[PDB]
Copies of this chain bind each other. A is one copy, B any other.
Amino acid sequence: TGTANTLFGTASTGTSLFSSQNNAFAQNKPTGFGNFG
């Protein structure tokens, strides 16, 4: 499987089975810059 790439939060490469992944984010003025390629 391919690489899992994240800045904030989680990067999950393993297979997930009956298994919950969750993330609650509360941001006051976030700024995100992505240069994907």
Interface residues of A (CB under 8 A from B): 1-37
Contact = CB atoms under 8 A, between A and B. Distances in A.
Contact of A35 (B15, B16, B18, B36): B36
Contacts of A5: 3-6, 11, 34, 36
A3 to B, nearest CB: 4
A2 to B, nearest CB: 4
Given A15-B15, A36-B35, A27 B24 contact: no
B7 A6 contact: yes
29 contacts: A1-B20, A2-B18, A3-B13, A4-B4, A4-B5, A4-B16, A5-B5, A5-B11, A7-B32, A7-B34, A8-B12, A9-B23, A12-B14, A14-B14, A15-B15, A15-B17, A15-B25, A18-B21, A19-B19, A19-B20, A21-B21, A23-B23, A25-B25, A27-B30, A31-B33, A32-B32, A35-B35, A35-B36, A36-B37
